[PDB]
Ligand binder design. Structure first.
Ligand SMILES: [Mg+2]
Ligand SMILES: [Mg+2]
Ligand SMILES: [Mg+2]
Ligand SMILES: [Mg+2]
Ligand SMILES: [Mg+2]
Ligand SMILES: [Mg+2]
Ligand SMILES: [Mg+2]
Ligand SMILES: [Mg+2]
Ligand SMILES: [Mg+2]
Ligand SMILES: [Mg+2]
Ligand SMILES: [Mg+2]
Ligand SMILES: [Mg+2]
Ligand SMILES: [Mg+2]
Ligand SMILES: [Mg+2]
Ligand SMILES: [Mg+2]
Ligand SMILES: [Mg+2]
Ligand SMILES: [Mg+2]
Ligand SMILES: [Mg+2]
Ligand SMILES: [Mg+2]
Ligand SMILES: [Mg+2]
Ligand SMILES: [Mg+2]
Lengths: 102, 56, 110, 8, 109, 46
RNA sequence: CGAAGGUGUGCUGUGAGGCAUGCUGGAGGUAUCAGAAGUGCGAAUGCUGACAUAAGUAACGAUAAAGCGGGUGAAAAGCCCGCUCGCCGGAAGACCAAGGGUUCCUGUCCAACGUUAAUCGGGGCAGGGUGAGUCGACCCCUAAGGCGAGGCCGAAAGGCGU
RNA sequence: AGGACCGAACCGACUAAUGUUGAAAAAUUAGCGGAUGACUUGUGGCUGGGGGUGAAAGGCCAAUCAAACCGGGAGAUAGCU
RNA sequence: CCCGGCGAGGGGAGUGAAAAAGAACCUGAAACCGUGUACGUACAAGCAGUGGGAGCACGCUUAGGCGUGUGACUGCGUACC
């Protein structure tokens, strides 16, 4: 469905940040795309009672739909809607409509 | 001893008249420039002038 | 909110608490007690607590240290009433609603 | 035992 | 029969090792990282707590339920800590008076 | 006074309820209509 | 750049109702002409739910009544300690069966439950707690009675019984 | 000796008051009858609905009895409200 | 962070487009219960309105004799099914 696995370096689309870098992410099958370029401060106080009594009043993910700049190699987007063949046995991921598997 | 039609409104709201509460009004007494409660000297130490209950 | 405090539940019925409230209005404030501390009815012990909490909110939400103020408002409302049963004449005369209220005290300017 | 309580 | 005046002395009586080898070992079953969190280099808080108390008057040390914002914004000004820091000491102290009253012989079971 | 009940487990089998149900056309019928028809957690014997 | 719904208002129709719009509201609605109805409530000692009334009235469960000093606590008439006082004692004591099924003990907490308060409890949440060759059940034995190989009956189901 | 006498337990219910939204869907209080007998009671068993049991009142058969309770025929029928 | 019993409950601050979304949480009507304000009201008889109607509180307008509320006094006058 998403295919975009971890370390998959994508780019921000749709809005807000936009045109930002971001890679890896933490998307999951029917899960969420943390990426790196989506996150405004955060809300949190000093609840932790451990020797590391922090506040977590900072840092956090900004879900956003999987609809981000497709992986992108040269410019941007470049839909990966193609399927390789006779490679692997499980999968056979292809890539942008520019070249072939990448 | 049964009743039959009774007007919640108006009526009863009238008997409530004799139901409001009331106000005290009392002093502080020489020492306590406040409390003194009612016709008592003061509770802080429960003394009218000295060794009564607990004081100096 | 122009420094409030109010309540909710606890249980003390409406009219029961609505009686002691009438005792305090207008001047109030400096009357955090006496016109209340010298009246014993459960309803009284409850309105005073929230009375102080309210007058206390005068050091947090707004300034105006405790000394002026007025308490131009005090009204209790009917709060959800608990239901229970009561063994009696085989089970006919049994309803028992615990009833409860609040107080909602206020302290504005004169 | 004073340190085994005040620190416990 | 207990207050800050006595609780403070318990800190000064820590001259001898202060537990550098005692309390440091009074937890065989360490909770992954309980030790360092308690000792805290023996100065991160172990020393600050004392300083905060030293900046307190004989009245405050006697009665803990008489300190307000007017006093909290003063102790932190002299000690160097903040408002929340001084509050933590009062909180940890409140749980001390409640414990030092519900026992007799060791308090074990 | 004596209110019509008086419990006694032993007196709760062949005399009534329990597993005795498995000894008669109707007795065993009860179980079907009971369990099957409208799944009952049932409990009978305790 | 605010639908249905709720609430106000203004205009409009003979009326059932119609529209325009303030506010609320947070997502949908549907001119028109036609089509089909779980099609329109004030009553049926109607059904369900919510809230009144009486009314802060009656009542707080055996007339064996309790007083005081401490403790604890936000607060004690009721809880813990103590001294008195009174009540039962073929029992209002002790043990067990039946039945109950953790109610037992310790620590805790007081929302709901205790016909009030509750720091207290058979309440909540935790833990802990019932150790058998001689006691009991299993287990041998059989009573009433039950079941019943084969068997005798009986449309079937099934009844009776060695 | 005795369906003998008096009288607790135990069994039963003649009278009055109270209760009658009760402490209680039959009791409490003061009296009352039997109390070695057709006595009284624990445990378990057996009789099933037109059927049982009955020192007989149509009484009792789970707060139900001139035909139990539960489910079904069932939306019985209702020239009546 | 602050009141409080280290309660309940709340008040700020912060999250959020909104907390007039706070977990009782969408919209939140009606009965029913309150606080505030304008007027009527303690010598007057009844289905409580309707017809007439002064005064009072606000609103009118370059008066022009009005709008909203309330309604003293007065003719009538026994709910619906
Ligand atoms: Mg619709
Ligand atoms: Mg009609
Ligand atoms: Mg009373
Ligand atoms: Mg009355
Ligand atoms: Mg009376
Ligand atoms: Mg009693
Ligand atoms: Mg339990
Ligand atoms: Mg116990
Ligand atoms: Mg318990
Ligand atoms: Mg047989
Ligand atoms: Mg005899
Ligand atoms: Mg009578
Ligand atoms: Mg008697
Ligand atoms: Mg006799
Ligand atoms: Mg028997
Ligand atoms: Mg019967
Ligand atoms: Mg038929
Ligand atoms: Mg019918
Ligand atoms: Mg809502
Ligand atoms: Mg007059
Ligand atoms: Mg008119």
């Amino acid at each position: 469905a998403a295919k975009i696995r971890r370390d998959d370096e994508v780019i921000v689309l749709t809005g807000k940040d936009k045109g930002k870098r971001g890679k890896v992410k933490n998307v999951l099958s029917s899960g969420k795309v943390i990426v790196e370029g989506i996150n405004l401060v955060k809300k949190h106080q000093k609840p932790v009672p451990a020797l590391n009594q922090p506040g977590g009043i900072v840092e956090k993910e900004a879900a956003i739909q999987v609809s981000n700049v497709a992986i992108f190699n040269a410019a941007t987007g470049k839909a990966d809607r193609v399927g390789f063949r006779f490679e692997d046995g499980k999968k056979v991921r292809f890539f942008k409509s520019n070249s072939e598997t990448i | 001893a049964v009743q039959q039609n009774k007007p919640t409104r108006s009526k009863r709201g009238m008997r409530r008249s004799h139901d409001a509460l009331t106000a005290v009004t009392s002093l502080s007494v020489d020492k306590t420039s406040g409390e003194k409660h009612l016709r008592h000297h003061i509770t802080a130490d429960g003394y009218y002038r000295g060794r009564k209950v607990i004081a100096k | 909110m122009e420094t409030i405090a109010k309540h909710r539940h606890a249980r003390s019925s409406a009219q029961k608490v609505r009686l002691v409230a009438d005792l305090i209005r207008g001047k109030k404030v400096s009357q955090a007690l006496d016109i209340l501390t010298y009246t014993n009815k459960k309803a009284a012990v409850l309105v005073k607590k929230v009375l102080e909490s309210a007058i206390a909110n005068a050091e947090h939400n707004d300034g105006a240290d405790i000394d002026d103020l007025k308490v131009t408002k005090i009204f209790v409302d009917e709060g959800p009433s608990m239901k229970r049963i009561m063994p009696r004449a085989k089970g006919r005369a049994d309803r028992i609603l615990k009833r409860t209220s609040h107080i909602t005290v206020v302290v504005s300017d004169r | 035992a004073a340190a085994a309580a005040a620190a416990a | 029969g207990f207050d800050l005046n006595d609780f403070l002395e318990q800190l000064r009586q820590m001259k001898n090792m202060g537990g550098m080898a005692s309390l440091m070992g009074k937890l065989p079953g360490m909770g992954q990282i309980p030790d360092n969190v308690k000792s805290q280099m023996d100065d991160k808080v172990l020393v600050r707590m004392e300083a905060i108390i030293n900046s307190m008057t004989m009245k405050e040390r006697a009665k803990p339920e008489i300190i307000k914002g007017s006093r909290k914004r003063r102790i932190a000004a002299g000690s160097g800590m903040q408002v929340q820091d001084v509050n933590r000491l009062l909180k940890q102290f409140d749980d001390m008076q409640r414990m030092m009253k519900k026992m007799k012989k060791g308090g074990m079971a | 006074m004596k209110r019509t009940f008086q419990p006694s487990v032993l007196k709760r089998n062949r005399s009534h309820g329990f597993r005795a149900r498995m000894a008669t056309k109707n007795g065993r019928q009860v179980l079907a209509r009971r369990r099957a028809k409208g799944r009952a957690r049932l409990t009978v014997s305790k």
